[PDB]
Amino acid sequence: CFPITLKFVDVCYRVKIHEERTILSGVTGMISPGEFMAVLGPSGSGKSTLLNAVAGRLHGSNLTGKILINDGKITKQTLKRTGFVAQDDLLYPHLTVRETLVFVALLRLPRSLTRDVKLRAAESVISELGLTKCENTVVGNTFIRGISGGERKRVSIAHELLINPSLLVLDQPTSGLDATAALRLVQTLAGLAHGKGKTVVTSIHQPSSRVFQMFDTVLLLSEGKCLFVGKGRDAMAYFESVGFSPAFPMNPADFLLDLANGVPNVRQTLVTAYDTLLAPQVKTCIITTCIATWFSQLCILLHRLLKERRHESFDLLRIFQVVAASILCGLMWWHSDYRVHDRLGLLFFISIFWGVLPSFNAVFTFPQERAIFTRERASGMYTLSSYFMAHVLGSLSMELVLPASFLTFTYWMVYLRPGIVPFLLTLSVLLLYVLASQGLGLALGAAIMDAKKASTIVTVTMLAFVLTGGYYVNKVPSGMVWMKYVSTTFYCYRLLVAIQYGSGEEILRMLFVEEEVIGDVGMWTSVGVLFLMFFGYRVLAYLALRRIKH
């Protein structure tokens, strides 16, 4: 019941010439709750920069104004009561529209309500916006042909009607629908402000006259400076104080947008007849359930993420290629015996393979979710902890079956140390190393939010780890022995060599000894550092995601 009163005074936004050009220059206005606003202007004006300014999405040293919610600046608490509908529609392309609106319903409604109230509120906004025939079809990308471009927008307004916010900042909501859905959409957005008493800000672009009668305070913009702030029928008459009237009966909207360019420099005489005639008048007018919440927000964000990857049939081919690589690694060391250089080669090639394959595929988790994650993080839907521990729990379904299907062939074809306990110890060490190296691909990929930029960082880093993982050079300079402890391949190599060759007495009985496990690190201080790396790379991937608010 937060009564948002939005007041902006003298906001200016200048970008560098890439001098500087003024996008906005001196915009003032007051939006008390109940007032249905409208931001009009030509297609270069500064409307969407003003709407990205008052919705908090624009911050920086460029803005030289004061945006005030309830006579205070924009906090983080008011940024979860403000609903923002952007121009471009960024949605999850593999869901349908019913799963999208159901997940936004279940994740954002007050949680004191039962589940069927949370579903009837989701299918009470589908019938209100008219998305009933496209209810059970996909909302896909440019390539994945899904729903229309006018239903990819009526979904992205019901995406923010299931928040019930107190300040509704819509950025061109109806540019994309016909003239009989525009009227019903503005009837909805006016029944949310002459009904439930909210604060609605619209940037409508090409209205009719009976879509213009619904507005209570129109902001007419022109090249950054505003021409009019005030009522609907006071416009089309305020411009008779300066002497501009149509010669024949037309709509008010195309006339107010004809005067917005100058259709003897009409624009500047309206700007100076604004600034001193009717601008000083607006200058005188101005715990135990906190856990259950977090676990429901994990079940939802995991059930969505497991619906995203049911479309992907490029996982049987991943399994069949890793099986082929395992058959290769088994058939080449087929003629190996237990007695050791030829086997340390295999136990280092496994450490190369499963530090290179998970870390080079984990750089596509967070960069490929960026355009939707920034939007949902700015909106304030879920917590970042519950979002991060859904990708973490979503990778751990097929990043545990590929090394198991690898090792199930390449153990019993090479005929390594027989018995079920060294096999299970080898499999557990391989799975722990895979999860430890996947954290590196998570962290480089959350820190540099670009798959192409991070794929040449993680490649050089994993090759430096493969280099200083104890196999290649014999006599390393002793001021540089310390680097193999920072490696992640070193611990897995030491553990695999330890598991296969004991602490080493039976080999010293049968038969160098230098890089075989009679050596440097123990067996528990090499699983105590793999677990530390598995936790620390994910803590760093969370801390590098905490910076992305925008």
Place this chain on the structure above:
Amino acid sequence: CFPITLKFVDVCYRVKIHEERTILSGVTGMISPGEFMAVLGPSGSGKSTLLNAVAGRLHGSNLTGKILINDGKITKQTLKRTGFVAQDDLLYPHLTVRETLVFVALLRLPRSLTRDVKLRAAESVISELGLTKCENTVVGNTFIRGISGGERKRVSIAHELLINPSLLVLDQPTSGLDATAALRLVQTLAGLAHGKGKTVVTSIHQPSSRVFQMFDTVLLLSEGKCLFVGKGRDAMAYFESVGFSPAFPMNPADFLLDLANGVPNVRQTLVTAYDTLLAPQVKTCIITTCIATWFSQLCILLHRLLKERRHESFDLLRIFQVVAASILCGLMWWHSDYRVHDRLGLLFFISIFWGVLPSFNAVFTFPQERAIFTRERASGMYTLSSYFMAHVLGSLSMELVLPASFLTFTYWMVYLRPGIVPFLLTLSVLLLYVLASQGLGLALGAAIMDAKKASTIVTVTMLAFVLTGGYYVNKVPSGMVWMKYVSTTFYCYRLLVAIQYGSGEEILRMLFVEEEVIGDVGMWTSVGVLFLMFFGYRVLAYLALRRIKH
């Protein structure tokens, strides 16, 4: 001067319920040259599927109709005379709008004209659409804040006015501009059909009445079936034959879209009053400069691609990380001598590094250009040969300076074979191997147009090449010796070992001999296969790009 007469008869398009739903059902119409059409309807109708059908962009077993240009089906020759302006605007985000319109001007105009005619035609469409104040600013992505959303559309119509096509199929051109740029844009598209005599098809959505007076044949659609085909003022009067008229004076457009839904099942009585009253009336109405062209199309597509990567300052950091990895590889083998296992380790780690780093970064060239390349390839702007030999010549500027900056440190810090001829032979073999392995990342990445799907194919393939590149296993089964010839790491390893250790007599004098160059392959039949691979992987990357027409 191709006089396109577009005629579609009984086109139906059904998608599977993911039974089947009819998107379109029985659409007929004739567009002779000079007729300015308009496709109207509600926001679920089947307009953009009809416009993707008649512009050739929809093909498949779903379409059960006949699209006819000049009483013949759509060839590839007519697909370079048809201009299609899609709903979503896919543009190159790093250019400005002036470079974008200049490159489309220089690349598509008849080439018999001089260059300044080709530039005055480019800045004669900027002033016509009004893009003069946003002429020299960027057109960037969702992240890169560039021009507006109404200037990201007035650019994507001047993108297809600099073709001068004979059939102009616009898909919602004005949904995004105000009511005084809509009138001027439809004045332009009507002066292209009452002027230069073309065939213009528009899907306008929210028109005025004086944007509706410009239309010569309106197609009113409703839920896939069409309600009206014919003149402008014959609509608003044909619906008086069935008995629907407004009670008070309004625009024709909102009335024709109010009847399009049923505002006693009005929609079906209009469909059956269409099908037998005024549908049978339309059933009765129905060399040495060829090289210079290709080289100009290479200079343009290369000067654009070198403008795309001037924004990237993440290349000094690539150079500084590869320099750090080289300093690492030098400092670890700092204590190496010329006399050989410790050096074959280094000559195989270089072969690992420069087969892993180029092939894992070359998978982002063609998947990251996909959404714009499919559009330009469907449009018919450049040839695929000249497009492919611009990415090929664009990678070869920093995929030749990273191995040189690597080797310049890691040769003289390890102190390998001294002299300028083994150094230059090593550098040339390294550059040839880098270009040979970059072709693998090109081919897997053109074949599977997804960076995430191809990054787990190229990783397993390069690890299989590293495995069967002659270093790891000692006694491979002899039915599997043949696999190292398919490898690309094997030839570079053999060449580096040959260059450093001769054919081998001085080492047999100073001092195994088995995997040192006294061995299997020669020195010329290992550069004759690296060149074959360098050509064959790029031929496969061209053949896998030839399938993407869409």
